[PDB]
């Protein structure tokens, strides 16, 4: 939440919220209808976006579904797509919140040692979320693509 | 060296070496000829070690050399076997040193960040040095393979 972030910064500086932060919260609560629309869009169309994302991921990076890979068979392939569903619902949570903090303290801290313990390729997960950004930009309007791509870019940047 | 570890501990506690530590240096300078013989055998027969270990590594994990992968191609397998030669030379350096600190300060400090920037699975390199110690114990004497597997054992533990 941008409100949570502004309150955290004002508490760290030991002061009330500045008029700039107050104007940002006011602009966010006026403009939240578009974020509501994008949340409804991604929640309704949650299936085909991760369908095409996983498909194009596997056709560009087949080393996962190669034998000896982390997700060779369809069982850990299903767990990989469940991870993708987790990342997509966190992207929707960041979209509704207006700041990247719920993404950060749910599923972005420690992902380095997480995926060194699970053996998954970090760059392959980053490429998969990049392909999610591509298919979401294909699915939605250009300004909507940019504002969802901000959180997608945050996720791929802190994953990679 | 083991004299370097003992001298660092003795300097940290700010007095001369305890006779436990001079016992360490004494038994090391009795066994140094045997350690040098083991390292000379590995240096002489280094090529079959790297070649057989890489071949059985490719047999165990074919996803690494599958197309689109990090190690796919004759060029990438050449660089990978150069890494194998690097690690084998470092373990021989550990054998002649008597400790594992040259191993750490050459190849084990920042190796996780190294292979994360390179997109290299450290668990696959851990399996690679597992097959390294398997082939080394196969073509090395058992009491010699005990300390060789101890130093390979440290490599597996720190790098896995």
């Amino acid at each position: 939440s941008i409100v949570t972030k502004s309150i955290v910064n004002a508490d760290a500086e030991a002061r009330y919220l500045s008029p700039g932060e107050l104007d940002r919260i006011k602009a966010f609560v006026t403009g939240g209808a578009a974020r509501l629309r994008i949340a409804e869009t991604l929640t309704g169309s949650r299936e085909t976006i991760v369908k095409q994302a996983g498909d194009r991921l596997f056709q560009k990076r087949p080393d996962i579904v190669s034998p000896g890979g982390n997700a060779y068979g369809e069982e850990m392939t299903a767990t990989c797509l469940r991870d993708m569903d987790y990342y997509l619902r966190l992207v929707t949570y960041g979209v509704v919140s207006g700041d990247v903090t719920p993404i950060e303290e749910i599923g972005l801290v420690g992902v380095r040692e997480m995926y060194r313990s699970l053996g998954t390729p970090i760059e392959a997960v980053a490429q998969s979320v990049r392909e999610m950004k591509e298919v979401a930009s294909g699915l939605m309007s250009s300004d909507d693509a940019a504002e969802a791509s901000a959180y997608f870019d945050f996720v791929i940047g802190k994953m990679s | 060296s083991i004299v370097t570890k003992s001298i660092v501990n003795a300097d940290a506690e700010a007095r001369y070496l305890s006779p436990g530590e001079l016992d360490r240096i004494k038994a090391f300078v009795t066994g140094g000829a045997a350690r040098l013989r083991i390292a000379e055998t590995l240096t002489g027969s280094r090529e079959t070690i790297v070649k057989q270990a890489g071949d059985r590594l490719f047999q165990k994990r074919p996803d690494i050399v599958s197309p689109g992968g990090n190690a796919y191609g004759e060029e990438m397998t050449a660089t990978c076997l150069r890494d194998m030669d690097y690690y084998l030379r470092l373990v021989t350096y550990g054998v002649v040193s008597g400790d594992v600190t040259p191993i750490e300060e050459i190849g084990l400090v920042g190796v996780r960040e190294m292979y994360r920037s390179l997109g290299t699975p450290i668990e696959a390199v851990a399996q690679s040095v597992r097959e390294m110690k398997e082939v080394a114990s196969g073509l090395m004497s058992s009491d010699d393979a005990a300390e060789a597997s101890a130093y390979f054992d440290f490599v597996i533990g720190k790098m896995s």
Binding site: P67, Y72, G73 | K60, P62
Partner: peptide, 5 residues
């Protein structure tokens, strides 16, 4: 080539 699932 075991490649166990």
């Amino acid at each position: 080539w075991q490649n166990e699932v």
